[model samples]
Target: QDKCKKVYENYPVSKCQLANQCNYDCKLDKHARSGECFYDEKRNLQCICDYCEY
Candidate 1:
């Protein structure tokens, strides 16, 4: 069920906190990478990693 796995085996990491925070095991589809993290009043922590781009 992982579409992005074919493209990205080892994903990237987005450091939001100390010691490389926001680290995730990327196995989602292409649509997942396109998504972004929005930190606004109406939004919350949405910071996604660019695994394919990396």
Candidate 2:
């Protein structure tokens, strides 16, 4: 795959209150292109920081 693909990095936040703020945490503070809260099958809520592989 090319750099168009996004790389996902899970943050230390165990739970997310605001998906909007989560975006800020990643895109602003965490410095990612995009971000979201991903609830995994492991039963954990995490902020999935997504930045392009570029």
Candidate 3:
């Protein structure tokens, strides 16, 4: 499980088409945080600042 936070950063929002932003409690590490995460993007999970199964 994991958590996340939303902060304006130099992301690929143009081509990636972000569905949403991370929450205030982002908790994914460098190794685990590498990937375009989403609710229905296979390995990607919803960007919520709460309990989640990453």
Q: Put down candidate 2 lDDT per residue, 15-42, tens digits, no spaces.
A: 3655476667767775777777767799
After superposition, which runs of candidate 1 have C-alpha atoms over 4 Å from their true positions? 1-16, 23-41
- Order the candidate numbers by TM-score, best to worst: 2, 1, 3
Give per-model CA RMSD.
Answer: 9.1, 4.1, 9.2
Report, for every candidate in turn, its global Cα lDDT versus the true structure: 0.38, 0.61, 0.37
Tens digits of per-residue lDDT for model 1, 1-54: 343323233233243333423333222444433333335476544345454544
lDDT for model 1 comes to 0.38
The TM-score, computed over Cα atoms with residue i paired to residue i, of candidate 2 is 0.60
Could you tell which candidate, 1 or 3, scores higher by TM-score?
1
Q: Which has the higher TM-score value, candidate number 2 or candidate number 3? A: 2
**Candidate 3: TM-score?**
0.22
CA lDDT for candidate 3: 0.37
Residue 8 lDDT, candidate 3, scale 0-100? 30
Highest lDDT: give the candidate number: 2
Ranking by lDDT: 2, 1, 3
